């Protein structure tokens, strides 16, 4: 089978912040995004004019839609992992939320970056890119990868 994974990371360490996304096809990175620019990291993605520009928009909006509140807390690392899997013509999905590297799933009452991240990450990703899209992208990307002259 095949899987397409998106790993969103927002690292707030004191005064500087880093926004990054990694796109992995079958546990191999094919695209990366540094908060500003997107780029291919595998030969078969070079020159792509369909997925790169689409992801650049989805990724930028993912972060710019997150209403992070300033904190006295000096360090906050937020991760959102989203993976679709196409195996035996069956579509399955998996998603994880990490706060400082630790998985969590439970929302609390207080207004925090941790809670907002948990309740809005999937939302902010799926605005233009739902599960069915991820599967169709996955199948299209498997096609490119298998037809790679490299």
């Amino acid at each position: 089978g095949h899987k397409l994974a998106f790993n969103f990371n927002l690292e707030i360490n004191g005064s500087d912040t880093h926004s990054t996304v990694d796109v992995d096809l079958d546990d191999s990175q094919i695209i990366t995004f540094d908060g500003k620019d997107i780029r291919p990291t595998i030969p078969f993605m070079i020159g792509d004019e369909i997925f790169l520009p689409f992801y650049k928009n989805v990724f930028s909006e993912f972060f710019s839609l997150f209403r992070r509140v300033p904190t006295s807390t000096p360090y906050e690392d937020l991760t959102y992992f989203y993976e679709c899997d196409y195996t035996d013509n069956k579509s399955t999905f998996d998603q994880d939320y990490l706060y400082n590297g630790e998985e969590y799933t439970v929302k609390t009452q207080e207004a925090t970056n941790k809670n907002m991240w948990l309740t809005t990450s999937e939302f902010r990703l799926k605005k233009w890119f739902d599960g069915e899209d991820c599967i169709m992208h996955l199948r299209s990307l498997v096609r490119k990868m298998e037809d790679s002259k490299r």
Binding site: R67, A111, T120, W128
Partner: protein, 122 residues
């Protein structure tokens, strides 16, 4: 036969007119926009008559508002949100709701700019 009358170039479907405005506005300027065209924000009342709402991408302001004091969601026309129509999902602390398919409402801060859907019956 014909569907309508509706405002020009609006969608027409089962005695309802619809338009999807891709300009981002907060809930209140969205409301003002629909009003200025003799319409209202989207009212969800029937899964069947409004089944086209099932294949709408993205998120859009509809006319649902939360009145904190009675703790209830109601449409612009004062009618209560009928049960088994919308799945309401907490997302951001707020008193307005974004429509998302299939028949979901995401709670959002009324001040947050979003695209919106206007609706006009008959």
């Amino acid at each position: 036969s014909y569907c309508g009358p509706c405002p020009k170039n609006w969608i027409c479907y089962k005695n309802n007119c619809y338009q999807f405005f891709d300009e981002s506005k907060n809930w209140y300027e969205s409301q003002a926009s629909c009003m200025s065209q003799n319409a209202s924000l989207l009212k969800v009342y029937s899964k069947e008559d409004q089944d086209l709402l099932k294949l709408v991408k993205s998120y859009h302001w509809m006319g649902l508002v939360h009145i904190p004091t009675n703790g209830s969601w109601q449409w612009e026309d004062g009618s209560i949100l009928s049960p088994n129509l919308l799945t309401i999902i907490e997302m951001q602390k707020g008193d307005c709701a974004l429509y998302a398919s299939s028949f979901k409402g995401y709670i959002e801060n009324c001040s947050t700019p979003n695209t919106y859907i206007c609706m006009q019956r008959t």
